[PDB]
Symmetry: D2
Subunit: 282 residues, 4 copies
């Protein structure tokens, strides 16, 4: 099942697309639907026609419906340094340290209102001169840390603020439009192997491919199971929590996002998440 | 006005104590009440008798009412290094850097469910061997960053995890029972000068004063106004958000909290926040 | 316990006055409070001062609070001919028939929005030229037909429409402002004997006692228990349903209510219900 | 548009069938949907497949969905004597009087919880020995008395209690299962002429047509407009109120309903409402 959500005249409607391309209008809240599916693959709803999923992906809005975040994740957390000047501890950089350590990096990324969806704008802080998108596989979780599904997430990061001081990381990570995900959440059975997926990032500036890069999830060294373990340790998470699993695609120092850029992130078996960029004003 | 809240048979009742010791049962949600008071000092409710505020402070529960968090803060944020081995950038420690920099440290501390109140237990992570309480003046904020009142907050911190790597700060800060506040929120007019208040920390172990230390808020170098400025920059906060303003009372490396410790924090004009300690099990 | 309710800035607050004149602000919905009291005489709430009950009775509104219906009764039903030209069946009038029959008269009187309280206006239909108040003891009921308390009710009746044809009774009984009750609901233990209470009706026109009459409930022939029996037979009623028990005070044909009349109804141990009259315009 | 509603795992879903047999799952509450349609014929929702409307009509439940009341009418009112021993006024029967009078009969019939829908059981009072169904055209109304649509209603009537005394009419009319309607509500444009419709009643006893009778609405003498006029006079009604417009099909005194009877009522352009009968136990 691949779950998406539209906003229509101020209210939400959730839909699921099945492998045979049939679309079901959901009876339940999408997080509840994902929990149910995780249990027995049951889906409550009616088959609908006239919902053009492919058009929604490309054009964002058809008539009075517009695609958005597939769920409202009560919490969003991130991991980093999970794939194969700077602050340093006894001559060794903090990033190299975490890479070699038993304990992975886990940080709080966003509340639901700080997240945006497919076709909506991500933001660059007014006081950042070097913000990069971070293209990542993300998991939707229940309160036990069980994986309810997979999605694409952009961990939008003010890399300059982070480089300035690791103590500025929260400021570099948490703000309005700091986070984007979708366009769908795919159930766990839609991804046979999460560690064999292609991730492609494109930054499009005035029609021009200003940056393009790809990585396969077979390069992830710090596994998701371990990330979840450290996330939930002494730390309860609500159903529908999203954990984003780090990035291996890092544009250069001259590749900072600017106003009206288009960020496109593709992941195998999920789709392509597309977000315009808005630079915040001082 | 000094605002407190009790839980009674599973529901909440908010009360305000006035300077003349009269107690008012509030008609409105306490955050809404604080916003109203900030505007015109109006308080909606009835004067009650038989609510023994002083007893609630000392004994926590009287009959079927128990004092708790005075509000549910939708977000809790913290600042650090605000008062007059380690990771370092060009030989200078990250903490010294922030101290000397224009940009203060701002971090996400807690969601409301990770916070506890007067008489309830704070927690030490199962994987921390050195957790300290951090006694702080905290402010309750509206969405514009206007100060709606003051309270005592304990920023419970796994100092060992932080010392290990600054990238572990979120893990050291955010978990069940990582945060305590109260026992009251005092309106802004109850504190003539926020920069002239005594803060006293006591850690009581089996009746013994295991640690005691005090500092005056006249030692705060990074002002609250500036902390709020950087908190809300490109970053919307909900009404009732709490910002805790850093600490200057830091017990030694041998003063780590353990199970059944009692942490007591006193601030002038607010009161004394008292929380037992629970060590989490692996 | 004697229960009343005020409206304040668009919201409700319920209060109970105890025999010793102490006033309690209720934690629960008043119907729920009455059900609880019926079980074990427990009352959840705080003692309040500054609520001037006697003034509310006389002046209706003090400051920003105004007395109203003590509850929202989900259904209101009436009985008639319960105390010691016309349509007739085999020469015997329909009213004489019911009086002598095993089956009492039971009719639907009002929905909560068609009822008014102490100090609010009752109405005379635009097409009635002879409307009388009918002063009655009324009972508040749970879904099992158990008596939760007693109150005063005015069954406002377009007597001319009724006299015209018994088939017009619903029209004569059910309309906006057709029904008034209060000013309090008294718990069952406040009335030792429901069949030993004085009921007094006064219609005041421009300061003049235009009508006055009284009857004692010892003249009720059709008992309340029996009225309840026939009400609930094959007919579920919600908690807080009010059943009004008929009248023995019947003003003459020249005593029809008009605009700005004041109707006052006193019942022993309950109080005096006072309602101005508004004549509806065509 | 023809609107129906199903109950599914304890929740409701509303659907509309269009003239071309396409079925739309409604976004809005059905009363709200009817109000919108009355304004500009707009219908908010998605076209669904796999909802077998014809099967629902015949079999009542398909899989986990069951047809029910198409709306919850906040109030149900009735009119009688609207088509072309006893109590009498000056030798003339009360029924003949209303027939010849300017003022029609209007009575309160049911609350929503006393109503049932297609495929659900109507009831015969435990104390009635002669209960008849009364097959009627009914209208759904907004608060201004505007007709939002038409439906079939069964005004289930304890005719023996009524004959006993006109003052027993409420008891004969108002009780659990006293009222049935559906299976659909048709919008006003689905009925070109409400006064040219065939109404057919069948009472089926153990497979046998125990009674059959029909009448056309061209025999209605007291028009619906006039019934609505007297209903709403000084008497506010909520949106979705149902007014049932009287009957001309009256089975004989030996045709009283009994347990397990099937009552079927057909009206042109609406459909056939089918309800089993349950005799209530003493």
């Amino acid at each position: 099942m691949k779950l998406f959500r539209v906003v229509k005249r101020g209210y939400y409607i959730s839909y699921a697309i099945l492998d045979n391309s049939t679309i079901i209008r959901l009876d339940e809240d999408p997080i509840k639907a994902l929990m149910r599916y995780s249990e027995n693959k049951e889906v409550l709803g009616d088959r609908v026609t006239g919902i053009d999923y492919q058009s929604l992906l490309k054009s964002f809005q058809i008539n009075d419906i517009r695609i958005t975040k597939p769920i409202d994740p009560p919490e969003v957390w991130g991991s980093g340094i999970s794939y194969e000047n700077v602050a340093k501890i006894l001559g060794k950089t903090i990033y190299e340290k975490v890479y070699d350590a038993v304990r992975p990096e886990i940080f709080f990324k966003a509340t639901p209102n700080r997240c945006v969806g497919h076709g909506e704008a991500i933001a660059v802080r007014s006081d950042s001169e070097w913000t990069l998108p971070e293209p990542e596989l993300a998991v939707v979780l229940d309160s036990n840390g069980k994986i309810l599904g997979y999605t694409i997430m952009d961990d939008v990061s003010a890399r300059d603020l982070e480089a300035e001081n690791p103590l500025y990381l929260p400021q570099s990570k948490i703000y309005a439009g700091c986070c984007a995900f979708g366009p769908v959440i795919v159930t766990s059975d839609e991804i046979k192997n999460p560690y064999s997926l292609d991730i492609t990032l494109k930054i499009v500036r005035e029609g021009r491919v200003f940056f393009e890069g790809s990585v396969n999830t077979n390069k992830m060294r710090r596994k998701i199971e371990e990330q979840i373990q450290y996330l939930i340790r002494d730390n309860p998470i609500p159903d529908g929590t999203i954990l984003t699993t780090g990035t291996a695609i890092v544009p250069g120092r001259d590749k900072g996002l600017k106003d009206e850029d288009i960020v496109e992130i593709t992941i195998s078996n999920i789709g392509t998440l597309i977000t315009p960029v808005k630079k915040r004003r001082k």
